Design a protein around this ligand. Sequence first.
Ligand SMILES: CCc1nc(N)nc(N)c1-c1ccc(NCc2cc(F)cc(F)c2)cc1
Lengths: 332, 338, 332, 338, 332, 338
Amino acid sequence: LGNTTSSVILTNYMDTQYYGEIGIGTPPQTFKVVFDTGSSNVWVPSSKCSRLYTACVYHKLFDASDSSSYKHNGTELTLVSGFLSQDIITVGGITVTQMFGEVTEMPALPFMLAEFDGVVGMGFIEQAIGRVTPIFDNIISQGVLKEDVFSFYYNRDSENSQSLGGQIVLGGSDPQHYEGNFHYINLIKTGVWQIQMKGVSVGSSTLLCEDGCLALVDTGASYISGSTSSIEKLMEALGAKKRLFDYVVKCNEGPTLPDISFHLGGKEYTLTSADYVFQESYSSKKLCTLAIHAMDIPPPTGPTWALGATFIRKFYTEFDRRNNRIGFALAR
Amino acid sequence: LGNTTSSVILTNYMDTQYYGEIGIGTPPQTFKVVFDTGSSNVWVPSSKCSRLYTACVYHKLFDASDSSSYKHNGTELTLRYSTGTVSGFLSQDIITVGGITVTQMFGEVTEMPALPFMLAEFDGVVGMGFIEQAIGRVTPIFDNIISQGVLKEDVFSFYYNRDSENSQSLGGQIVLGGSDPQHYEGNFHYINLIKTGVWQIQMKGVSVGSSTLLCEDGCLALVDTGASYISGSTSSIEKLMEALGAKKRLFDYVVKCNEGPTLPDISFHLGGKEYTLTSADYVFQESYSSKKLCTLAIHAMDIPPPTGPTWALGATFIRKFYTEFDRRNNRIGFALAR
Amino acid sequence: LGNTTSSVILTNYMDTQYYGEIGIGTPPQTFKVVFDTGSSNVWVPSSKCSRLYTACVYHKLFDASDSSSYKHNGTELTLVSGFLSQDIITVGGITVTQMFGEVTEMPALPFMLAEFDGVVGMGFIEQAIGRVTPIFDNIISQGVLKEDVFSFYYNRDSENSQSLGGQIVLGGSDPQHYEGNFHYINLIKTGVWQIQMKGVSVGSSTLLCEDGCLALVDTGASYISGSTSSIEKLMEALGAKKRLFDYVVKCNEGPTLPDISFHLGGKEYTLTSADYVFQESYSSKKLCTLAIHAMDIPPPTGPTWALGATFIRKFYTEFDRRNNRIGFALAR
Amino acid sequence: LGNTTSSVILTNYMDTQYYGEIGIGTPPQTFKVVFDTGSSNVWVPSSKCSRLYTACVYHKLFDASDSSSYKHNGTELTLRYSTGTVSGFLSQDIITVGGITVTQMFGEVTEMPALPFMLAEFDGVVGMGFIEQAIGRVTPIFDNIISQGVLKEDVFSFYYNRDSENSQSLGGQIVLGGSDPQHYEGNFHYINLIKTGVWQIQMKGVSVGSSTLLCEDGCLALVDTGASYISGSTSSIEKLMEALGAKKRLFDYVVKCNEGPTLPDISFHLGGKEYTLTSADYVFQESYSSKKLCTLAIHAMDIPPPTGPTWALGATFIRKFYTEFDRRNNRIGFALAR
Amino acid sequence: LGNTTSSVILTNYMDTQYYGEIGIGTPPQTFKVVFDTGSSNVWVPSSKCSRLYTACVYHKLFDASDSSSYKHNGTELTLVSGFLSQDIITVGGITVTQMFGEVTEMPALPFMLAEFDGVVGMGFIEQAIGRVTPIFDNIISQGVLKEDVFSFYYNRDSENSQSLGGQIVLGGSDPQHYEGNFHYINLIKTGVWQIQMKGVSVGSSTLLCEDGCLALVDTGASYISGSTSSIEKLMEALGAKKRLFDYVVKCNEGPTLPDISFHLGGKEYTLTSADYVFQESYSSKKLCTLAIHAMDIPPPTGPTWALGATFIRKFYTEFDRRNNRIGFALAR
Amino acid sequence: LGNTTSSVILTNYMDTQYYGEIGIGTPPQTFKVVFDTGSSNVWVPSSKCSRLYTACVYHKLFDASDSSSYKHNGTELTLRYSTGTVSGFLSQDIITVGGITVTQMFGEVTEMPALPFMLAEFDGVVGMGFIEQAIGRVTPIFDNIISQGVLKEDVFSFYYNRDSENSQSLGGQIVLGGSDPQHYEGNFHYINLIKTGVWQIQMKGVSVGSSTLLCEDGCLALVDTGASYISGSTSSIEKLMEALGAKKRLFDYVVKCNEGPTLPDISFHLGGKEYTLTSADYVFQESYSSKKLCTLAIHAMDIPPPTGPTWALGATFIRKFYTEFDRRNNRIGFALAR
Ligand SMILES: CCc1nc(N)nc(N)c1-c1ccc(NCc2cc(F)cc(F)c2)cc1
């Protein structure tokens, strides 16, 4: 451990994508990336990614020939698909030699939707493709960070202000963006940012996850998600119905929807309807969507709930690698 | 050189005006002022300003007749900025900036045009430029502070925050006599001034996405804490905006708001480092509708000689890069803001 | 009878809620209330209403200890639920001693949706809970009102003007807000503001209420409503279909929808599509909701149609207690 | 005291300017004027106003050279309002207000700042304040009308309507010599003037929702028919707006439009009665979107001594409470408007 | 052939209606008309059209008594329904004696939706009601037009500019509104602006119109249309589903939808998703409609695809009567 | 009469300002100018304009001290337009318009009001009116060009395009010495001037939908290429707008945007032809929402004698009808623009 932290300011796109800048190479080629606890690899699109893929026409491409610190590897990789490479990556004034995927195959679904170019995986080496050492582990190895933790702040989106979209801090947490103190929940096992959940209650009753369930704390996921069956039951409880792609409520009835609490480590983490309905409107004549979706995550990680941006906006989150635990604090 | 550093807390008005408080006179009369590296004079509105100037009805006015430490001068002066002009006369009084007290000559402005000054949240200006550019050859405030031998270094630094809906966010901060490591990370990278007298450096190029399409043979960059935007010459900005697909309006350029998030990066090559802004850094993203127009924080501004033709790096740039102005070594440093 | 009238200016919220100010107590504690011909009691939320109910966290609460004219009663009341109390109520410069409910139980549905605090029931003593003398009867008893009638004006909502939301006049009507002359329909029986309807026609045919039906003229109802089966048939005739909560038409086709006429007292009361579709938009790419809804009102009052705000916006309405009749006039 | 009352029909422009017609000269030249209890002078724009004042291009101008009843004076005068200043010279002519004809001294304004006067639908102002506050000690119009002994009472009354899309709505009404019972209900409740010379009364408190958080130890309220808004001192309004969750902008405070309808009541304790406005009374509710900002009809205004520091009760207040100004008894009456 | 062209500037209403001005009579009475290759008659509403029809209350009516060049015919006509008449019609500085229908019966569906008054049919005499000589044939007969062709430009709608809605050129084409050169497809037969289509492909596959189909190039149609079954299959391929009246996609997924290509005369005419989705919004929380609809056009003309405004906005269109062919060029 | 015609390409700013380029001096100083049949003087901003005039900070300024062909005059002049005034002094220099070079007297403007000129994309004005209306009796530019005997006809013509998002659209075009048949179709129809000295013709009526409700007994129409809108007297426009259901605002009339497309035609009876505009021709249709207000390109403007009372036919009209101004025959021609 050293005495430094490193932060990266994040752009908030529509409350569904949060991404910041990294540089790859000498000199740095700068990319927008999501910092994703749900995966363990760093990857960006390659200059060799065909224009067949419209995804690779609209994103920043890494040109290895323009970097003097680039070292070839070539090992194939299926994260998207491409090959392994080594270079110097700059993340908020920290520079680290890192192995990353140069993606040469990139289908239009989903990464046409991506306002970002790549992903910096903040998960464990256990889930890394090619057992590549993740970037946080490589930065830990430098012995410069104050603590072996990293933290996420995700802001609510505003049309009336050019405020910060969010912030990741490597090596600590930023007290300007939470209140009170952290309470922690231990990981079920190392290798996955997943914790036991003791119940999910809707207002005045625990209707869900009685007898316990799993919660992946996933900074790369837009929403709170559960299994199709869990969400069907949750939405039934809320009075929401599937419009056709998404679940909606009359925008005027959104403010009357009950609190949803997630029971994590002996504490109740509560979202009010303001925290989970997108009040794009408030009229009795409009429908409003919810920031909670079904997602059937297959084994071995799932079936599981995922606590994504919806949850993180409410609760400032600290990922503690020293102690294999996750800390939450309110706000702000 | 002494051992003191002083900070001034700044307010951020809509990402376009950053100002802090100074006190003038005995007892102090307080004013909201922009700290401006693109000018070298101090001025505030005067009680002698005719109230037919509506900007003088809406701002704090200095009243010499309420200050016991006031010293008359009366020399006329006119101060011309790229977006407007003020006129008045010289006075001397005691000025407090971040707990530093300094005897200072400043302009009492008696002519204050409604356009633009009715749109100014700030009252006046504290020029942080060099005496070489001071109108009336008036000694600038920082020079007068340096003369006291209290500052730890002969430098001052700027932090400009992003805007916020929260009251608890600091809009920005100027540090006199040093830099605040709480608001930057990594190392400062320095570029020497082309010449002492102007906070202006060489720029090696400007690239828009994957093309160094501008400043290909070198150009100038004024580092201007008093400028809201990045600016270039009309001809450079026409080309820049063509590349962005932006539409020109009377005072600004806009894109359709839905197109904002996918606009390309823009990089400024300064002293062997590339300084890159993404669209989120230079678009006022106030909607994602195709039916709305979103303004860019990049404008055309033909800065006349001898300072220009030049680009100016203003608040749009400084929000991303913490900036240290070094008078001792005649250089500017940039570090990644946090 | 005297020579006075008393008016109360009403706020229009979204064309669905119309409410004005009353004062309760000495000194007056001021509340937003709907003036409701569909009920017969006055009630406001109590200072003793638990914060368990989020409804009672967001509304003005009556504190009896701060009123020197307050007299305790305590008799339980199920209107919402609470207890009876007496105090002086101020309604547009008229002051009357009135018994009202202090509501201490207030569920989140519907009164979380309420922009108003309480209800002043303008119905008959026959439907009053606890057979409490309604406020209009108590004001009639003072012998100050010019006539034993009260009238309602409900304006259309505007984003481009801060115009009056509406107006209730006690003791008369305001000719500034209607044109021509009143025509009246007698109540089927005293005790309920309900009249015979002789038919409901859609453009060029009487498809509904052939052989007659009931129409409750309900200033507390947002919409024109009929039975589920009547509205199903009406909407079928219009080409509207149930989006999921509400009936909609393509906003561009709204202007082409036929007139709907309600046959009341030998006269035809006609709404054009402008009067019953909420043209929140006009594009061929948007759906627009209608201000007509199904509502199965149970016995003894129903089954019945209700003519609420949708109807009243078109037709200035006079409730005539002397003659047990209801008068309509156009506009304006 | 005579037996006549006269009414003047007022136009309501956007709930912010209420004005009626007067005629000046022979033959009459007509002007749109605000009737203003917060000032004591009459003025209209002058034909002598340089057309470099764009406000003089866009308003009706008095031309003495077309009036046979004009009497020259020429004394310079400047009239300072909280939102702007006009300057000109004194003239006398015959003025008709609601069929009352009165010989009156008024300002011919030759200096008329584009900001704010290009935003004024009205041409000039008829001050309904006391001679004590008349610039140049000019006898105010109401005094001159009282001197004729035609009015039934030495009082005048104001009705300000809500805005309307209908042409048939009366924007408002001033009654000279009495009050119109068609536009109020219940009884007048009266508060004595702190002092003759100013239409200003004691205020006992200001409460926001369930908290007398302001004016706890008493304060002043100017009843100002020339003011669009309720105003208080900057410090009072900061606290008021904190309680409402309102955001400060350059000239106003806003809330998100979706939050407008559920903002708390605001009450003003005047003379043993509470005067309560709901959010619908003080929010310009122009949408219910969370993405839009809605302006409040309550502003900060530091009214300088000797009149202030004071609150001002303007159109926002008068829309709800019909107001009678009583010169005979040096008091103001309020009754619930209808 | 002469050496003149005549153009008419068109108003664009919502990307669904394009209409310009013509004058009928001496002096001209001016009408808004759609110029429609899908029909062969000129008609406008008559002064004798009953106000029974609300369509005829909201449109310009032709008053024959106010024209000194009017000659009576009276022959009944079912296009809408009315009678034949003759007068001088002015179309962009060309004046022609023309027989047209005065429509005296005009139902509320669809022509209440019409922002235009009438139709100038640009189809062939073969489909003319009453075998009335169409207007273009009568103008050809004058021998003034440079070529026996007419061309259509339809602009995309803008809220941010008062740009031209579109343009028809009689006698030629306007190079300011296309790029490159025309390529032509021969009509299957004279008498109908209908061409063979060799396939309709969605991104990477020809799923539709394998073994060929028909394409009516219809300047009077708002959309690209095909049979109910073809569109069902197209929409399935796109991931769009029927909201209730129309097919929609999540507005955020619109940009990821594949290109649709129409194989006409050996060339591929490609629309990107930008060209066929109405991106009224771009959020993940809104639904967006497509400018492609089912339309079962009955014999003898159908079953057929119709290439309407959606197609024409992408491809500037030249209707070549000399050669019985249709030319397309990109843009602009 | 010679054999040359010259065209000047015009830029269309938002359908309200149409301007082209001229060069003044040696070497040329270029200016954006409106070509204005409603005035007879040439002016541009002057380098002598005090920079306290913010409009002079934002526009191109003529500097006589950089022109070798400049000839001093110095006679003061003031130029009054319906929407604002400028003041300055007379100068002479060489002016290039479409490759015609002409020695011309023009105004160097030193007083340039921020309202309206901060809203002007153009720098100055080239009056295309007659010498009879020239302030200071200065010979107008077209007269001076006619005197050279190079033009094919003693006429000039205007084309004003619709606005466009495309860069490749020509905003408009003036042809000196003839007309461009590429931008009109059908035949010109001509109306004689009421009198030489003013580009003003008789109008026989104005009809709104199916009612000649205005100008029933004849009236005047100024054909004014310097006017953005069609205008009439306040009283005529009140009646016109009543018929349209339009609401009056400070500077304009609006309808709800959803109602725009179905507003009735408006026709102007000029010289035995009806000139008809549809709602798409006179509504700024910027949305189809009932919640938004859409401005009409028809305004009230009381044009004082001796020219008015008169209607003015400006850009709203000219966009539809290509206009030829014929000095030889003292007439105006209209043809359908393309
Ligand atoms: C071209 C000179 C001119 N000629 C005529 N015949 N009429 C005018 N009103 C003007 C004239 C037009 C615009 C301006 N200023 C520009 C302007 C005016 C406005 F009323 C509103 C704006 F936004 C911008 C000044 C004078």
